[PDB]
Amino acid sequence: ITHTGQVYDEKDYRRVRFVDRQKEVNENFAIDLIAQQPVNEVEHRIIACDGGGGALGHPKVYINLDKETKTGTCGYCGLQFKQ
Amino acid sequence: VRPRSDVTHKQLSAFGEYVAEILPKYVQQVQVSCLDELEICIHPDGVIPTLTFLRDHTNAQFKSLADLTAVDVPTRQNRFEIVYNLLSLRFNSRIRVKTYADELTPIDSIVSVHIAANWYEREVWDMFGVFFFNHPDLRRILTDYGFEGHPFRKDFPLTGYVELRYDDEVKRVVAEPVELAQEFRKFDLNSPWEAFPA
Amino acid sequence: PTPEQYVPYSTTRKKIHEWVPPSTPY
Amino acid sequence: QLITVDEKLDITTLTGVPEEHIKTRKVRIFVPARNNMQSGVNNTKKWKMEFDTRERWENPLMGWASTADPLSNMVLTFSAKEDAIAFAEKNGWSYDVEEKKVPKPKSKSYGANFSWNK
Amino acid sequence: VYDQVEFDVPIGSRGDCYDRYLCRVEEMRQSLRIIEQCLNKMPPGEIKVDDAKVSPPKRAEMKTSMESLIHHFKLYT
Amino acid sequence: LGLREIRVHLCQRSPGSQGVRDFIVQRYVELKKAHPNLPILIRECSEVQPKLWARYAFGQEKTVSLNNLSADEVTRAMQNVLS
Amino acid sequence: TSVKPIFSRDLNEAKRRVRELYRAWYREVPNTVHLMQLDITVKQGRDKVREMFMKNAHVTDPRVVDLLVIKGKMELQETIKVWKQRTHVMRFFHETETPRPKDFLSKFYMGHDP
Amino acid sequence: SNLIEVFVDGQSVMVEPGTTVLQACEKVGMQIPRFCYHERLSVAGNCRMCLVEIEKAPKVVAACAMPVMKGWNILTNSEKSKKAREGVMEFLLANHPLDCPICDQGGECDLQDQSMMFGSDRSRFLEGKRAVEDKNIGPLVKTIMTRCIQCTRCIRFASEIAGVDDLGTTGRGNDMQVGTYIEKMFMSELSGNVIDICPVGALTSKPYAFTARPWETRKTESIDVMDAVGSNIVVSTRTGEVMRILPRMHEDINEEWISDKTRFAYDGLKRQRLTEPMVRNEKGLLTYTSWEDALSRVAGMLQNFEGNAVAAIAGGLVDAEALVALKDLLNKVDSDNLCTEEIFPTEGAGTDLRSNYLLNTTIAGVEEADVVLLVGTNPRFEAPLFNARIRKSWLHNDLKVALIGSPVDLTYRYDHLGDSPKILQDIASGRHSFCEVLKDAKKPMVVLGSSALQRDDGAAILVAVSNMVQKIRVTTGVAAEWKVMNILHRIASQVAALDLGYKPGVEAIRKNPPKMLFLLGADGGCITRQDLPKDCFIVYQGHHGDVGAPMADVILPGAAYTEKSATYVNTEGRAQQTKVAVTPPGLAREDWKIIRALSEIAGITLPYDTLDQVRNRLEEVSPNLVRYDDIEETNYFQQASELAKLVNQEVLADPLVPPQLTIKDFYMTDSISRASQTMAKCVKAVT
Ligand code: SF4
Ligand code: SF4
Ligand code: FES
Ligand SMILES: [Zn+2]
């Protein structure tokens, strides 16, 4: 159901709660949204990742897209960068 | 950097000796902090005498009692540190006189010297448990009527031991031992690295 | 610019997992 | 004039603690060790006495931890072993002091490891 | 900087509920005198101490400078 | 009366137990050899006078104090226990 | 040892004060049960005063006893007047709370930490 | 004499010769800021974050390095030694990637704090940063090495404390990266310590990646039960489940280090865990039920049976308290059939003198030894923090190590005398060459592993070793308090069990089969239900359902050492106390109470009813149990030998082999370990 698949179960004593009232779950789960994000190709060995917008992003980090074997992923945006 | 005026540091220091000489008997330590404040420390027996001299001395009139409080250092044999902060509208100055009292060794009351203390002394008894002899009417002020335990003592649990809810069966509010639904998360915050004292 | 109540619930999982008894009788 | 009492100050009767939490609570006086993570030793200086840990059941509605023990989060800090022992005796809590263990002196010298011999 | 402003304390005589009242209406009046000045003479400058030690670092700085993040993390936590 | 276990709790390096350890140093091997199954336990208390605890059958334990007793009295007391 | 006195030099004198307070409460129990319309029996109430008085019967420290009555007297005042409304008084009787067994087997069957 | 007088700002702290500038500050009471220096790791001087200013000297000196001289004044809080830190911290931070809200060494950073205390308010590095390439060092340590401050602590530990010698520096300039040149995993015990020793969060723990953040973690100090070294450890619990176990320092037992098993098998503690007391159904399948019903299932059978008919086979990881509660109980049913799974030879004096079964040479005595005769055990995988002891004493001191076992990876240079128990007699004859080495030694120590004893000729192996210790002692003329003979265990509840008079080995149960057996945490295969009598009525008393649970008529769940205030004792008899970090789960209860309660239902009630009372009980049966942190000095080796001489046994030619031949052998052994997903991931990584 939800992000980490919370599933109050058919036998749980808590699934009682939703009776006559819906559960809060999310469409466009994020888990798949960045996976849906194209790999940002770059020329330089290392690249930055302000998160986009500077102050309105994440603390800037420099990712080493040095091995095509792996597309660097800024630990903050989950954006893969293709050397 | 704060705008320290050495002019003060000196004048207050000089008064600190003045008082120390005037009442050699009860003053144990006197120091003018770098924050430009004097904190005469007196033996508990000097509560009445030291205050009275400050309330009624031409060269040191300290008419109003700003506050009476009791820090509790559990390590210290004398647990409580009654602190009396006083003001002098005449000399535009202040001084703090602090004494030490243990749980069952009461301090004298100064309601005579300043009637402001009538309430604060009741506040110190209710929260910390120090007792004040010769107090007109010492009785809990801030805590509930049936409260058991002195709350601001460092050895008292924050949440306490009793909480109240309304029970239908008995149609009346009823204490029950505290049961909390998210305990106070006790974040440890002290850093293992000190700061080289200036 | 030119029934729907949010029921609160824990979203974490089971954590401690108990040992299932063997369904094979012995 | 002062009066004489050989009775260990016990003031359990004035502190205002429920009977259950004065007779079933064991507190340990210990100097905190250092999270191996950091090499600072400023948190291994003062002695602390900590009450025994108690139930922390999960809450059904939100899954938050819930505790029925009031003296759980309370850790009092005492500068010396003697003073902490005194607090336990007059408050009536049982105590089991643990001796401070400080790192033993270790001899180090940059020249010593350069010794091919050993 | 209540020293740099100029206001008149509203002292009272025949102290009683009416007199003190008049005093509170007069400090409402005197505070407008202090507010006026503050608007007339407020300096260009920063609004928080520059010691990241005591004041939290500006968000542009904590998002571009390592010493500022460390100071932001430690100050808040 | 079968006694399953015989325990000797000899405090160490203290005036009182000297005789108790002397017993061990001199005749322990002898006793064990003779009763080669019975478990005779040599344990070391502290700040307590020596006690020859004996466990008889069906979980009954009996106590004989060995404080300041001579080597043969310890030997005699031990011999009295396994009758 | 060597401890200053509060109101009683010796347990003896202190006990005098306890006697007075007991009397005070004893004489008061009936009134409270009527001015607060409490649903308790005077005999029951006086029993409570006894219990509470007895609960601290072990103390032998002159100073501790003196504070105990100071505190006791203060409670009386509150109760004497109506400062302590019924909810406050009945709390003494622990009427709503479910009693906990002290038998080991009982605790074992119910709580992780006894 | 040998007391240099130097002034730390005027305190004239007189120190011994060779005291380093930093050491003097420690003694006077200060603590010079420091990144590359660890007390038990060699001084390297890489960071130079410790620059201080000796008075009247042109340049500032390296604290960790300069041996303090006479007359020096180590001005620490000078206007210079602060520009020598305000300017270094400028550099460490300049190339640092600011992902402090990723770095799980968030509050556990010796580089933010030192920055917040010995650093500057702002940065001037307007230039760009560097980045390194994350590699794989294994399944336990996550090396996000773009964090590395090139402090070379790892390369030291990985060479000096552990003998891996793999991690190394590669390259020069600002792209010196301290990672394995070829990608070979850092597979060794003692591996996880790198996490704790890297002050930066470059390489940290992968299981505890992002589950918590240190300020929240409530820290309860307890004892290691996975191995018999009894290493001190701190269990970090948040909101009631253990989040990490990291070492806490014990000079004598684990000096700041813990094994890979006892810090990544906290995960095993949270699954396959018994919680409610099930009992067998009509069809035989086990079914949950309330204590009252499960306890009287057991109590009724107990009243019916008696003597030999009832037995216990205490497993590993069972607390001493539970042991004495199980012996008292089975003693009130007239049964002394109390047996531990690990067989310690008990034909001569065993269990009776307390030195036949204890390392008499305290772990800290491996430091002052001269020759160690390892016989039949792999210390590397049976007592990892004792293997380290012989590691340090072979490096900093000069121990001559000799092994009579399988030639095995020992992280040090040993002499492989051979793989045949017979060679013991050879040395006893003095014919063997090593005889001379031993003879040359003044303070020698033999160590007979418990696993050699677990073979069939173990009684003979102990006797053969005792003969050699006897003449080694006579030829060397070693002093009495120096103790040559010691034996190390690999099961936490073995020294405690033998102490309380539990008789080792299930040999007695083998000869007469008990109608009822109360397995007490036993997951070993020592007795199986086919072996048991027809009734086969046995009740498991433990925490994890592994081998004893599915063959159990009753399940009485217990706790684990993270969940009870029990006592354990390591190999040289130092009793130690586990503290309750988390309340036990489900209806599960403390081991001692289940047995006190079963006794009440049975009617032969045990005397104690609170744990202080059970501690008082332990005192009457045994001394060590009540006095904690206190090794028992005197032992009676001489009378032990006399009985050894009476015993005649044959040491079979079969070579004595440690069961843990290589490290995959090591990762999964006990119940908690077996139940570890992290240990399982480690096992497949090796395979
Ligand atoms: S190490 Fe991790 S935490 Fe310490 S500073 Fe660098 S990033 Fe922030
Ligand atoms: S990894 Fe951690 S320890 Fe090894 S060098 Fe880089 S920083 Fe120092
Ligand atoms: S600690 Fe002094 S050089 Fe690294
Ligand atoms: Zn990003």
Flag if E68 and H123 touch (Cβ within 8 Å): yes
- Contact residues on chain B for H110, CB-CB shorter than 8 A: 193
Calpha distance H466→H645 (Å, rounded): 9
* Ligand minimally distant from the alpha carbon of residue A77: 4
Dihedral angle at the C-alpha atoms of H583, H588, H593, H594, nearest 10 degrees? -170
Calpha distance D47→D77 (Å, rounded): 6
Query: Hey, is the C-beta of E63 within 8 angstroms of any chain A C-beta?
Result: yes
Calpha distance E73→H118 (Å, rounded): 16
The CA H116 to ligand 1 mean position distance, Å, reads: 12
For residues B149 and B156, the answer to whether their CB atoms sit within 8 Å is yes
Token pair recorded at residue B79? 């647990």
Per DSSP, the residues of H495-512 read HHHHHTTPEESSHHHHHS
Pairing outcome for strands H13-15 and H4-6 = antiparallel
Query: Hey, is the C-beta of E68 within 8 angstroms of any chain A C-beta?
Result: no
Distances in whole angstroms, Cα of residue H327 to Cα of each of D116, F58, H345, H497, H599: 57, 11, 20, 10, 11
Flag if D101 and H249 touch (Cβ within 8 Å): yes
Flag if G64 and D54 touch (Cβ within 8 Å): no
DSSP H592: H
Query: Hey, is the C-beta of A57 within 8 angstroms of any chain H C-beta?
Result: no
Q: Give the start-to-end residue ranges of the domains of chain F.
A: 1-83
Token pair recorded at residue H168? 């190394």
**Could you list the residue range(s) of the whole structural domain that residue D33 is in?**
1-118
Flag if A62 and H99 touch (Cβ within 8 Å): no
Calpha distance H435→H424 (Å, rounded): 10
How many other β-carbons are positioned within 10 Å of the β-carbon of residue D75?
15
- Contact residues on chain A for E70, CB-CB shorter than 8 A: none
> Which amino acid residue places its CA nearest to atom 4 of ligand 2?
H154
Co-location of H13 and H74 in the same domain = yes
Mind telling me how many Å the CA of C9 is from chain H's nearest CA? 17
Token pair recorded at residue B34? 């770098």
- Contact residues on chain H for C23, CB-CB shorter than 8 A: 285
Co-location of H335 and H402 in the same domain = no
> Which amino acid residue places its CA nearest to atom 1 of ligand 2?
H148
- Contact residues on chain G for B106, CB-CB shorter than 8 A: 6
For residues G15 and G69, the answer to whether their CB atoms sit within 8 Å is no
Flag if H115 and E70 touch (Cβ within 8 Å): yes
Q: CATH topology for F1-83? A: Glutaredoxin (3.40.30)
Calpha distance D36→H192 (Å, rounded): 12
> Which amino acid residue places its CA nearest to atom 8 of ligand 2?
H151
DSSP B84: E
Flag if H77 and B198 touch (Cβ within 8 Å): yes
Co-location of H604 and H637 in the same domain = no
**Could you list the residue range(s) of the whole structural domain that residue G57 is in?**
1-114
Calpha distance H378→B73 (Å, rounded): 54
Q: In the beta sheet, which residues pair with residue B84?
A: B68, B97
For residues H336 and F4, the answer to whether their CB atoms sit within 8 Å is yes
Calpha distance B186→H11 (Å, rounded): 39
Residues 6+ apart with CB under 8 A from D59: B181, B182, D65, D66
Calpha distance B79→B70 (Å, rounded): 9
Radius of gyration of chain G (CA): 18
Q: Burial level of H282, CB count in 10 A (0-12/13-18/19+)?
A: exposed
For residues A49 and A77, the answer to whether their CB atoms sit within 8 Å is yes
Residue recorded with tokens 């040892």: G1
Calpha distance H103→H294 (Å, rounded): 49
Q: For chain D, how many structural domains are there in total?
A: 1
* Ligand minimally distant from the alpha carbon of residue H200: 1
Calpha distance H680→H140 (Å, rounded): 12
The Cα angle at residue H634 between residues H631 and H635, in degrees rounded to 5 = 105
Q: In the beta sheet, which residues pair with residue D30?
A: D48
Residue recorded with tokens 């001299």: B53
Calpha distance H327→H496 (Å, rounded): 13
Q: For chain H, how many structural domains are there in total?
A: 4
Mind telling me how many Å the CA of A18 is from chain H's nearest CA? 26
Q: Which of B144, B153, B64 is nearest to B103 (CA)?
A: B153
Kindly report the backbone phi and psi dihedral angles of residue G28, in degrees, each rounded to the nearest multiple of 5, phi listed first. Answer: -90, -30
Co-location of H401 and H336 in the same domain = no
Calpha distance B162→B164 (Å, rounded): 7
For residues H167 and H155, the answer to whether their CB atoms sit within 8 Å is yes
Kindly report the backbone phi and psi dihedral angles of residue H136, in degrees, each rounded to the nearest multiple of 5, phi listed first. Answer: -105, 120
For residues H217 and H243, the answer to whether their CB atoms sit within 8 Å is yes
B 2-31 → D contacts, CB under 8 A: none
Calpha distance A43→A66 (Å, rounded): 10
The CA H214 to ligand 2 mean position distance, Å, reads: 20
Q: For chain A, how many structural domains are there in total?
A: 1
Stretch (H or E) spanning B13 = helix B6-22
For residues H222 and H561, the answer to whether their CB atoms sit within 8 Å is yes
Calpha distance H482→H357 (Å, rounded): 17
Co-location of H526 and H612 in the same domain = yes
Co-location of H11 and H116 in the same domain = yes
Calpha distance H588→H557 (Å, rounded): 5
The Cα angle at residue E51 between residues E47 and E55, in degrees rounded to 5 = 60
Token pair recorded at residue H593? 């109470």
Q: Which of H607, H585, H598 is nearest to H518 (CA)?
A: H598
Calpha distance A38→A20 (Å, rounded): 41
Flag if F57 and H627 touch (Cβ within 8 Å): no
Dihedral angle at the C-alpha atoms of H676, H677, H682, H683, nearest 10 degrees? 80
Distances in whole angstroms, Cα of residue G70 to Cα of each of B125, G7, G29, G53, H458: 12, 10, 18, 13, 74
H47 belongs to an annotated ligand binding site: yes
Q: In the beta sheet, which residues pair with residue F8?
A: F42, F52
DSSP H67: B
For residues H274 and H554, the answer to whether their CB atoms sit within 8 Å is no
Would you tell me the crossing angle of helices H591-602 and H320-331 to the nearest 10 degrees?
A: 20
Calpha distance H626→H615 (Å, rounded): 6
- Contact residues on chain B for D43, CB-CB shorter than 8 A: 190-192
The CA A75 to ligand 4 mean position distance, Å, reads: 7
Q: In the beta sheet, which residues pair with residue B80?
A: B72, B101
Calpha distance G70→G59 (Å, rounded): 15
Radius of gyration of chain B (CA): 21
Residues 6+ apart with CB under 8 A from B41: B27, B28, B29, B30, B97, B98, B99
SS3 H143: strand
Co-location of H231 and H379 in the same domain = no
- State which amino acid sits at residue H91: F
Q: For chain G, how many structural domains are there in total?
A: 1
Token pair recorded at residue B118? 């009538």
SS3 F40: strand
Residues 6+ apart with CB under 8 A from D103: H39, H249, H251
Instruction: Locate the chain H residue with the closest alpha carbon to A68.
Output: H133
**Could you list the residue range(s) of the whole structural domain that residue H221 is in?**
213-270+667-687
Query: Hey, is the C-beta of H421 within 8 angstroms of any chain B C-beta?
Result: no
Resolution stated for this PDB structure, in Å: 6.3
How many other β-carbons are positioned within 10 Å of the β-carbon of residue H642?
16
Residue length of chain C: 26
Residue recorded with tokens 């090396």: H143
List b or e across H473-484, with b for residues whose CB sees 16 or more CB atoms inside 10 angstroms.
beebebeeebbb
Residue of D23, D39, D93 to mutate, testing the H interface (most H Cβ within 10 Å of its Cβ): D39
From H99, H128, H131, residue closest to A64, measured CB to CB: H131
Handedness of CA H288, H292, H293, H299 (dihedral sign): positive
**Could you list the residue range(s) of the whole structural domain that residue A47 is in?**
1-83
Calpha distance F60→A45 (Å, rounded): 81
Instruction: Locate the chain C residue with the closest alpha carbon to H536.
Output: C26
Q: Which of H120, H127, H65, H222 is nearest to H559 (CA)?
A: H222
Q: Which of B133, H551, E17 is nearest to C25 (CA)?
A: H551
